[PDB]
Ligand binder design. Structure first.
Ligand SMILES: NS(=O)(=O)c1cc2c(cc1Cl)N[C@H]([C@H]1C[C@H]3C=C[C@@H]1C3)NS2(=O)=O
Lengths: 50, 192, 288, 101, 50, 192
């Protein structure tokens, strides 16, 4: 049986949420934190002119 | 916070501890304990499957210690149409983020030693602090791409090397906050 | 109350909370040149980001560049995370999870507390009397040595012995017996697992009886006409006059009982004991 | 320098339950333990309420006992019958529709 | 709407039982020629099968 | 509050009133109306039952006032391996938190005497306030463990002796507040 996924396509409405499908919220969060660190460092480098 | 001296000892031992745990987590043969097959074509047996970051092994079957590179080879035509899923697959195949956590935490964990050579410059600590923080951010994205690729339950549990990874995140950013405390002394001496 | 979210989700939530808190403490309190311009010390940022996660008013707000972006994207994150969690919270409470102790029909062959056995003088015994599959051989070896005699005189006696032994005795019987008896009032028994083999019933005669061939041809014509299935429905599946067929079609009423939620009040009362102790230690520290 | 006398604690701890913000955060370390404990307890309770209410607020209609005589022809738990000397009884007396027979 | 989508993360699944299939021209169905299945539809007189 | 002196009488009479309601609640034979039996097998089907904390009793049956101390029973089809249920069994077969509340509320009723006798030999008066409040928390959890057992749908109706638990809970914590109103000024008498 070297191909079958054995997925019937059931309907049970108590299936826990998949972290993979949520994940892009975390990818956005991490991209935001990184861009924030960038903006903080460049604003500090500007403020260091004064 | 306690004396400004032991903060340096605590920062350096924290950086050491996090770096040791993350490199071990990167290097360890296993991250989770599960079931399946470590190598086939064993297509008629099942083996408790013992898979790490870049390498994998298996045990308690008919043979033990047949360790191998991680099973994260390409997919059926890689579905470049589903480019976001290929991106996930490629990023977890070109497993940059955990070795980047190593690399960042390496550079920060040494850079903090130049708090005491060329001392009080207080910008060398800032670059260490930034990397201490960025190492944990790089660890968290690394964790999530692992599990997202896993979910790209089958009776499995995460293991010691995985709890070391999470413990490396916890400590690396404690070092990060401790570095900022040492910064907001040494720099306020210049700003008043 | 934490069931709707995978335990890896709760883990990554805790680490994302930490990874926001410390980045607000880094980006604020960054010597924005005395320098006292940001209130977001680490314990304040660690409090703010909790309140933002819980969508609860927080007096402090960054107002700086690059800290106000951390806020903006921690709000965008947490809106969508609790939007999803809340949607499934109440749902994952009234589940009544199944607790079947055995599944594989082989877990019986690992233990000596769930007793099991077979009907005396029947195929349910002859199959173990013949079948050299070593799991079934060890089963038969136990069944032929466990006192008191695990056999029973009748299927009705085995159906009784299950109640005589709270299901700590498993009765073995052919599937067509089990999936009938499970459906009969009060339906206190239940099937587990698959089937150990695939035998069947046959009409029998003395050897060489003249009925053998016309009976075979009749059985085949009754199968080709589709009579044997409707005769089976007439006695097994239509007569599901009981809780199994009913629960296959009928479900509980609504509302929400306390035991669904009692864990929140427990961790609450614990949290208040902890808060009291963690201030009393600090008070007595200053007292000495 | 600390506002949380009884009649402020008793108001914060309500404005936090009703998810409408609060005048001020607690600043005591333990005051923030009891704050986070309350914010979690409320997020559970008034998420469970607001999710469950969404089941109730759809419509009321009654599934009723099984119609079509589907289950009536199959279980003894609902009895039924017909008028004696009637055309309906004669129809059951004669029909070859399998459920009716 | 998100709370409607997250009622279950599963496919809809298709029409079955050949009821609508035996009551539409939109999807054809058929059987193996010279097969016992074709012979079964030939001689079995269950109303849906005829 | 005003009336600086009689606040001591008010809080101590409150403590004794709470202690009285609490001990009556713990001592009362009945706690809720329910279906049941006077003795743990009326034994045929039921008798209208007024089940208590450590007891069950009954009314309007073939005998009345035949109350009995309540115990535990052998569960069936296991389902005790979910040992939080066994944890609940232990926390239910022994009324630990309610009886601890009695002892804590009594311990407060002793410690509050240190307001005036051997007055304010260190902050000892504060401890009484903690004991009053600790009795409070013990009631809420003692209630909720009780209901999270006996609700296993419930269809019952609660009795006045249960409301004596809720009311003695309220009074104990309000005595707590008033004991802090004592403490905050007895401290300024202890320390200026
Ligand atoms: N379990 S199975 O589908 O592979 C299977 C199914 C069947 C088997 C044997 C097996 Cl292994 N033999 C039976 C026959 C054997 C004897 C017993 C019943 C009949 C006579 N027909 S069956 O019931 O169709």
């Amino acid at each position: 049986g070297e191909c079958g996924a054995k997925d019937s396509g059931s309907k049970e409405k108590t299936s826990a949420l998949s972290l993979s499908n949520v994940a892009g919220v975390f990818y956005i969060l991490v991209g935001g934190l990184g861009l924030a660190m960038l903006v903080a460092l460049i604003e500090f480098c500007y403020k260091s002119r004064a | 916070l306690f004396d400004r001296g032991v903060q340096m000892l605590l920062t350096t031992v924290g950086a050491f501890a996090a770096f040791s745990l993350m490199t071990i987590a990167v290097g360890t043969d296993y991250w989770l304990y599960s079931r399946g097959v470590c190598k086939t074509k064993k297509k008629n047996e099942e083996v408790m499957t013992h898979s790490g970051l870049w390498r994998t092994c298996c045990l308690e079957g008919n043979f033990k210690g047949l360790c191998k590179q991680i099973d994260h080879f390409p997919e059926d035509a890689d579905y470049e149409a589903d480019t976001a899923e290929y991106f996930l697959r490629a990023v977890r195949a070109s497993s940059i983020f955990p070795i980047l956590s190593v690399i960042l935490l390496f550079m920060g964990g040494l850079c903090i030693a130049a708090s005491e050579f060329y001392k009080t410059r207080h910008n060398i600590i800032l670059s260490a602090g930034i990397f201490f923080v960025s190492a944990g951010l790089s660890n968290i994205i690394g964790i999530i791409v692992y599990i997202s690729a896993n979910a790209g339950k089958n009776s499995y549990s995460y293991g010691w090397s995985f709890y070391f990874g999470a413990l490396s995140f916890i400590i690396a950013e404690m070092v990060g906050v401790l570095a900022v405390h040492m910064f907001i002394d040494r720099h306020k001496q210049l700003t008043g | 109350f934490l069931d709707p979210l995978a335990y890896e989700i709760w883990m990554c939530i805790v680490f994302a909370y930490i990874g926001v808190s410390v980045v607000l403490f880094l980006v604020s309190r960054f010597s924005p040149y005395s320098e006292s311009t940001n209130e977001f010390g680490i314990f304040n940022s660690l409090w703010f980001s909790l309140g933002a996660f819980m969508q609860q008013g927080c007096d402090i707000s960054p107002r700086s560049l690059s800290g106000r972006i951390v806020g903006g994207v921690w709000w965008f994150f947490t809106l969508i995370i609790i939007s999803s969690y809340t949607a499934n919270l109440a749902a994952f409470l009234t589940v009544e999870r199944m607790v079947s102790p055995i599944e594989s029909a082989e877990d019986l062959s690992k233990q000596t507390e769930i007793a099991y056995g077979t009907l005396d003088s029947g195929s349910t015994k002859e199959f173990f009397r013949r079948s050299k599959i070593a799991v079934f051989d060890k089963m038969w070896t136990y069944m032929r040595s466990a006192e008191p005699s695990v056999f029973v005189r009748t299927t009705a006696e085995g159906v009784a012995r299950v109640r005589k032994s709270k299901g700590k005795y498993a009765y073995l019987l052919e599937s067509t017996m089990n999936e009938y008896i499970e459906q009969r009032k009060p339906c206190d028994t239940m099937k587990v697992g698959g089937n150990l083999d695939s035998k069947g019933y046959g009409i029998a005669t003395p050897k060489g009886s003249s009925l053998g061939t016309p009976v075979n041809l009749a059985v085949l014509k009754l199968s080709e006409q589709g009579v044997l299935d409707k005769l089976k429905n007439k006695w097994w599946y239509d007569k599901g006059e009981c809780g199994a067929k009913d629960s296959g079609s009928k479900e509980k009423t609504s509302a929400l009982s306390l035991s669904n939620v009692a864990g929140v009040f427990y961790i609450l009362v614990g949290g208040l004991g902890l808060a009291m102790l963690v201030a009393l230690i600090e008070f007595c520290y200053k007292s000495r």
